[PDB]
Structures are given as structure tokens and as C-alpha cells.
Amino acid sequence: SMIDDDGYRPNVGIVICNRQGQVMWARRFGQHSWQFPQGGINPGESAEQAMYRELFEEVGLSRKDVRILASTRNWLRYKLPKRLVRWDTKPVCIGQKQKWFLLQLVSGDAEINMQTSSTPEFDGWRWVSYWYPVRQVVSFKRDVYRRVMKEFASVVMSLA
Amino acid sequence: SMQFSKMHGLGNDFMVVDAVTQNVFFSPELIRRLADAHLGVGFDQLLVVEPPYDPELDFHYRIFNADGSEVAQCGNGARCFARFVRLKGLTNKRDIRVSTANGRMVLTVTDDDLVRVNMGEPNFEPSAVPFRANKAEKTYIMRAAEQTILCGVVSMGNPHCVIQVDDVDTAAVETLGPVLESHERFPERANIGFMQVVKREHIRLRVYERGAGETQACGSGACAAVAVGIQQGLLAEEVRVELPGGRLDIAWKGPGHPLYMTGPAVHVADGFIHL
Ligand SMILES: Nc1nc2c(ncn2[C@@H]2O[C@H](COP(=O)(O)OP(=O)(O)OP(=O)(O)O)[C@@H](O)[C@H]2O)c(=O)[nH]1
Ligand SMILES: [Cl-]
Ligand SMILES: [F-]
Ligand SMILES: [Mg+2]
Ligand SMILES: [Mg+2]
Ligand SMILES: [Mg+2]
Ligand SMILES: [Mg+2]
Numbered sequence: 001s002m003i004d005d006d007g008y009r010p011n012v013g014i015v016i017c018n019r020q021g022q023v024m025w026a027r028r029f030g031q032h033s034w035q036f037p038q039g040g041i042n043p044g045e046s047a048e049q050a051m052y053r054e055l056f057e058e059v060g061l062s063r064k065d066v067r068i069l070a071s072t073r074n075w076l077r078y079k080l081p082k083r084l085v086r087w088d089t090k091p092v093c094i095g096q097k098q099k100w101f102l103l104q105l106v107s108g109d110a111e112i113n114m115q116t117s118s119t120p121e122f123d124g125w126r127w128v129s130y131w132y133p134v135r136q137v138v139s140f141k142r143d144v145y146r147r148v149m150k151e152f153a154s155v156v157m158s159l160a
Numbered sequence: 161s162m163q164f165s166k167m168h169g170l171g172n173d174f175m176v177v178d179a180v181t182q183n184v185f186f187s188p189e190l191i192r193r194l195a196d197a198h199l200g201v202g203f204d205q206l207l208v209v210e211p212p213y214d215p216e217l218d219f220h221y222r223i224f225n226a227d228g229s230e231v232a233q234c235g236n237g238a239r240c241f242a243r244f245v246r247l248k249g250l251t252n253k254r255d256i257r258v259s260t261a262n263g264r265m266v267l268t269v270t271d272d273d274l275v276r277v278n279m280g281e282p283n284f285e286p287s288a289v290p291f292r293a294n295k296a297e298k299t300y301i302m303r304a305a306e307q308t309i310l311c312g313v314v315s316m317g318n319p320h321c322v323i324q325v326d327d328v329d330t331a332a333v334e335t336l337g338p339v340l341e342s343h344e345r346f347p348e349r350a351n352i353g354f355m356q357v358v359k360r361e362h363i364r365l366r367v368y369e370r371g372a373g374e375t376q377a378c379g380s381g382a383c384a385a386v387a388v389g390i391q392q393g394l395l396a397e398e399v400r401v402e403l404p405g406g407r408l409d410i411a412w413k414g415p416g417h418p419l420y421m422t423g424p425a426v427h428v429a430d431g432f433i434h435l
Contacts, residue, residue, distance in 0.1 A: 021253075025215070128215035131180055131250070135211035143183065150181040157252040 007094035060113030171405025188228030312388030319350035320384035337368030377405025
């Protein structure tokens, strides 16, 4: 597995903004909860490669649909609430360790398609104001999200 | 170290806190501790900027008093909020949409770093002020004690009765204020304003508020005195208003239009405090 010896699985997170400073907010399949797209890094691929792969399979966006504006320099970690840790699965994953990417959607909204995958983790999306995700994300991701949106704010604010 | 700023608007001193990029919970115990000028920071009111509840708005902010209670006065602290989120890089917008305890507003930061608020359309129908009168007029007569006076009456959410003085330092504010504030023709009382017209575009004004008396800054009174002076034909479409607390600038195109109030917000200091 990719789980390091602390129990953190390497992970990539995606913040997609438009030219009006909104960010893409995605609903998880068959659930009430919304979040930014995120996915595990696979063996042999780097963070950026895992990002482009997860971007296409879950959001349907190509390399030419977006532009990389920024990325977080080091790992951001959150621990799963112990209610959700699957202890019988070894090596046990007690949390996720994430590198975050800020993308600008270069193409039109019509190039988003959340069904390019047989196994969609998301069944819907909408644009939301920049800081809305900090309140609405599930509690155990909130510290990561606040740090991410704080780091990315200057880039998004300095566009139109 | 939780960071904060001190700001000033409407003759009021605000402690302003970015709770968007900072993780802080403002329990009433923490608020009273922060209001203590020796243990905490000391403030008239505390303004807390939060992420929005609605995906279409940019922020939510709350105001707490020194007792630790949330305060819901419409428009309160709007000018310092709008400038603060821009000063701190939380947004670059000039039209900022925000929710408060009294609903939502659109705040506009003009290029002179003043903040403009849409206060809605004034209502002169005496039924909705409320005012004991048979129908609306540009001026009313009222016998107050041993003295007959002239006045205009308008509601901006709250009742207002405005009368023209010829200087506000020479104004009978403490002897005349209470008599008309609790006048029988005002079933819910009214804020009484003493308006000295200096020019069609310039006014000085003191206000005897409904329950409080003279506050150094009352925004609704400045809106009311200009709304009546315009409807009475005495004032231009854009008036400067000078109160003991500072200067506001009102703008209103007459009935059918909303009235706009523009005011300053002063950033006086930044600070740290460990909680
Ligand atoms: N209410 C709520 N539950 C969530 C949320 N995200 C995840 N969960 C639950 O927590 C479990 C694991 O959480 P995550 O860390 O997000 O795992 P994951 O998103 O499936 O992992 P990747 O998408 O591959 O990064 C999931 O099976 C969900 O049941 C959320 O945003 N809100
Ligand atoms: Cl591609
Ligand atoms: F994933
Ligand atoms: Mg995923
Ligand atoms: Mg995954
Ligand atoms: Mg996935
Ligand atoms: Mg994956």
C-alpha cells in the first residue's frame, strides 16, 4: 500500500475556480455531503499525475480544460474520526495526507462531466463563493480546508 | 496568537476579527474576557467575520456586545466590515454581499474607500411611521407644550420626525427632544432630528434617538433628515450630513428610488492576543 508508517494515505485535492472567483463544489455519490474533489495517489505516479487522472475520471476535465495556478508546498494532513477507521484492514489508514492544487477552468462549464467513470464518487456540482467551503465541509476536514483556502486566496483575489 | 484589528465607524469603536482564516469560537465567556480592557482587548462592540451560510453570498458577520450577547441592529458595523475584508485580502470585490442577524445586504466600497449602504425607500405614509395624521403632507403642525412647531415625518424602518433649526449648537435638544419623542401622535415614539440647513448639499444635525436620547452618530436619522428635506423641496439629490460623531453622505432620487448612505471606516490598529 501507499499508507506511510504513520497511517496516512497520500492524497491529492483539487480546487477549481472560474473567472468570477467561484469554486467548484461537488456532491458525493448517493450522499448528502459536498466537498472538493480529492483522490488517492497511485503507485508510481507523482502528485500532479494523480491530480490530472482524478480530475478527468471524477470531473471529466482534460489537461487542456484547466490551468494550474498554484499548489500547496508540503503535505496537509487530517485524521479520520476514529468512528470511521477500518481497524481490520491492514495496514490501517488513520488519516489522509494531501497536496492541494488550485486550477482555473479554462474551458466552458459544458466540459464538466461527472459521469466519465463507471464508479463515480460524485453525482453533482455547482459554483459556490470562495469561502463557502470552509463552513460547509465536514468537520474533520475543516482545518485543512481553512489552511488551503487561506493559502490560495491571494491568487484567486488577484484575478478579475 | 489570534489576530484582530481595531476600527472606528459611526462614532463607535469596533474590535474586528477574521474568523474566516482563523479557527475561533466566540462563547459569551470569551467575549466578556475580550471586552475587559485589562485582561483582554477592550471594545465597544466586537465584529466577527465568518464564512457565508449561503453559496451566493461572500461572508457572514456578527456583532457582540461587552456582555457577550449577539446584537441585531440593522446595518450596524457594515462600513468597517466591508473595508476590513478588503484590507485583509479576504476579497477584492467592491460590491460585497453579506448576511447579518438582520438579513442580507449588498455593500459597495467606493474608490475613495468609503462604504455605501442601500437603506431602501423612505415611507411618508403616516400609517406606517406610525403617525396620528389624516394624510401625508410635506409639513405638519404640532403643538408641543407652549410652542407650535413645524416638522416632516418619515419612516425608514423606524419612525422619524425632523424639524429645521437655524443652528444645532443653539438647539433646544434636551428640552424639546423628549417632548416630541414621546408625543401622543407617535404611538411607538419617534426619533426627533434637528436639522440646520447650511446649503442645499450640506447639513449639520443632532438627533434625539427614540429611547436613548442624543447619540453622537445615528445613521437612520441622517437618512431621515435628508429624505424629508428633499421631499420638502429644500435639498439637492446628494447631501453631506455632519453629526457630532462624524460626516455621512446621503443620496436619494426621490420616491420610487432607494436611498443610499455612504460613510467612512477608520482602520486604527492591528493586534495579537493569546486565548
Ligand atoms: N458527512 C460527510 N462524510 C464524509 C465526507 N467525506 C468523507 N466522508 C465519509 O468518510 C469516509 C472517508 O472519508 P474521506 O477521507 O473523505 O475518504 P474518501 O473521500 O472516500 O477518499 P478519497 O476520495 O479517495 O480521497 C467516507 O466513506 C464517507 O462515508 C464529507 O465530506 N461529509
Ligand atoms: Cl488529458
Ligand atoms: F478518489
Ligand atoms: Mg475522490
Ligand atoms: Mg480515491
Ligand atoms: Mg476518486
Ligand atoms: Mg483514487
